[PDB]
Ligand code: SF4
Ligand code: SF4
């Protein structure tokens with residue numbers, strides 16, 4: 001089904017982006 | 033639409049920064065300058081006179097002896113006399 | 123490959139920062155210091171002599187008296203002499 | 213703790229609950245509009261839902277993300293209303309995108325509606341059991357010819373604002389004309405461009421020194437006459 | 445506005461469109477190469493497409509992501525080219541990975557190609573109606589044994605550049621050799637390490653005071669002789 | 677280069693390899709616990725795997741994301757252990773959630789286990805052919821009634837640490853008690869506060885000047901008595 005998959009993928013992408021922001025701002029990385 | 037997933041878990045992502053910041057929003061340290069050296073900018077006191085322009089009206093809440101923001105400063109010639117009739121000079 | 127799904131229109135996603143920002147790119151304010159007090163210097167004024175060590179040579183575009191970058195400063199004994207022969211020191 | 217009465221709290225723990233109805237009130241009186249009452253669903257008589265005597269008309273509405281939090285940014289729930297026949301755009305073009313208005317969400321259980329909503333009549337009616345929330349509209353991110361999406365925010369949201377809102381000196385003033393700080397209450401003498409206007413329909417102050425002199429209230433001038441603190 | 449002729453704009457109004465054709469020109473003269481002409485498709489005769497007299501040979505080329513904007517970042521569209529038989533790798537190993545070259549994209553409608561592309565012969569041919577864009581190759585993000593992806597950029601894009609190019613130095617020159625400031629045109633006298641040579645192929649200044657003294661152009665030295673400004 | 681023996685290196689290149697076994701050792705002795713040996717697999721006799729004489733009992737375990745890098749953030753591989761019957765919860769509330777311990781991962785090829793793991797008996801046995809890694813547990817990101825997830829980190833990780841670890845001066849000392857810098861070895865005289873005592877159990881130093889005066893050891897005080905340099 002379209003809309004359910006779209007909303008699920010959007011929320012999962014938001015969670016992934018939040019996790020990436022959290023993990024890259026520790027000591028090194030590119031210091032976002 | 034009847035059922036909704038999308039739950040994740042916020043019990044681990046938000047602890048990652050520290051558990052004490054969870055209950056208190058933590059304070060804000062100022063910026064250290066080379067001239068400031070050991071001294072750190074105090075948001076509770078500033079013992080000096082600052083230029084009026086480019087400043088913002090400060091507020092006081094309790095005690096805290098403090099300087100000011102100078103608005104007018106000028107040097108003139110003083111009057112030779114206190115008042116009344118006592119005007120001895122020599 | 124014939125179709126292009128997910129058009130993904132962008133409307134308020136760029137308005138959210140402000141509307142004048144998408145017509146004019148705004149300007150960058152300088153950083154505020156503490157030992158400077160309240161003199162909010164900008165990026166196109168300099169009324170003091172600077173030091174030309176590993177720095178860039180400034181440019182000027184119109185009017186607006188400016189300082190400089192000192193390259194050589196030296197003090198010697200002022201010898202007696204004018205544009206002529208009249209050299210009286212009496 | 214909430215102000216929910218004991219009876220609804222008791223009923224909410226029951227194994228066989230009833231329908232959960234949500235009603236919405238859009239208030240624009242603080243902006244210059246009217247009070248609009250919406251409900252996502254109607255009764256069995258094909259009529260607007262009657263609650264507390266008043267009628268909520270059945271119109272498109274759906275909210276998502278309403279939540280209370282303390283960490284990070286403030287919560288911004290999203291409202292959606294179907295814009296058919298141009299009804300939403302009609303008030304949008306007149307009320308400046310419905311910004312600054314108030315939205316009140318009321319949540320009620322089905323077994324407490326007015327008796328006129330049921331053919332047999334509900335004997336368990338008590339029009340004082342509901343849960344109330346209030347938010348303010350922030351922006352309208354979508355006004356397509358099919359729907360309309362609104363962003364909500366807390367009334368006490370703070371951002372883009374500084375605490376000490378005074379700017380020391382200026383050649384200009386900083387108060388508001390005819391307020392409790394300027395203190396002027398006389399007849400019209402000057403206009404925005406400092407011309408001798410004796411008409412009150414277009415009285416304005418240039419907030420400058422001459423405008424203040426025109427009204428003999430230079431004592432209450434907010435700007436300080438320093439100027440030369442930086443030059444000298 | 446665009447430099448679009450009236451005829452092609454008039455044709456681009458009707459419902460029954462013709463076939464859109466995209467042709468690419470890779471220019472490497474400014475970097476040390478040749479001009480390569482590519483087309484994604486060939487004519488009905490199984491021959492290279494003839495346009496304006498010149499010929500574009502068939503090769504799998506695909507450009508995606510052309511997004512002209514005034515805010516945010518710059519534009520970086522992607523060009524994909526099939527790397528079979530090692531043809532792309534051949535020039536990549538020679539032309540420093542195709543860095544610094546120019547790419548020109550021309551789009552044309554089918555009904556304006558040369559008559560030799562059609563068995564009956566087009567009577568509507570007009571080799572002056574096309575839309576032209578130019579870009580510069582920035583990097584070869586990925587070149588495998590089956591394909592090759594190039595990133596494109598605008599020629600005037602600023603990134604990593606500073607405005608006040610002037611730099612104050614103590615004992616090192618700032619400009620090139622013989623270009624505009626070093627008004628030297630005599631025989632070769634020095635080399636990289638300031639050795640007394642008289643051969644022109646090894647004449648390169650050491651960017652010092654000694655080089656200037658050797659070349660008798662110390663009056664045109666870019667290094668100010670301050671040095672001792674921070675010791676005191 | 678790695679310390680892998682020649683024979684296992686030769687075998688790893690063979691086209692027909694054997695099974696790969698991973699064994700885990702959790703050491704809490706530096707924290708105050710015991711050594712636990714886990715293996716995701718058992719032998720053909722339904723028995724714990726015997727390696728080097730010791731026995732790794734069969735238990736759920738799975739390591740993921742083992743990465744080594746020199747740039748960017750230090751890698752944090754994860755470990756998953758099934759928490760059934762509350763086995764993990766039994767030590768989590770006792771060992772402070774397994775924080776600070778050590779984990780050792782040994783990988784081995786199936787053709788080198790002890791002969792007791794095979795009914796016929798492996799003749800190609802060598803108990804000195806394995807690959808070893810060690811990490812430290814950082815946090816228990818997830819703990820439920822079905823599983824448990826641990827994050828691993830390198831012992832050398834330098835997150836949240838500052839290089840020069842001295843405060844220079846204060847009204848208080850900045851060391852330990854009875855270390856190799858305080859240099860005190862006498863009988864108990866003071867406790868957490870400035871109260872006399874004579875028991876070794878409650879020997880504590882307030883790390884102020886009064887403590888030094890109590891212990892007749894002031895020449896080893898780590899606080900410079902300036903105070904007025906900041907005022908005057
Ligand atoms: S300027 Fe003088 S008059 Fe105009 S507002 Fe400020 S105070 Fe009132
Ligand atoms: S150093 Fe003197 S000679 Fe060498 S380049 Fe600069 S100017 Fe020309």
Ligand code: SF4
Nearest residue numbers: 849858881883888896
């Ligand atoms: S204060 Fe004096 S006694 Fe207490 S620890 Fe520091 S040095 Fe040892």
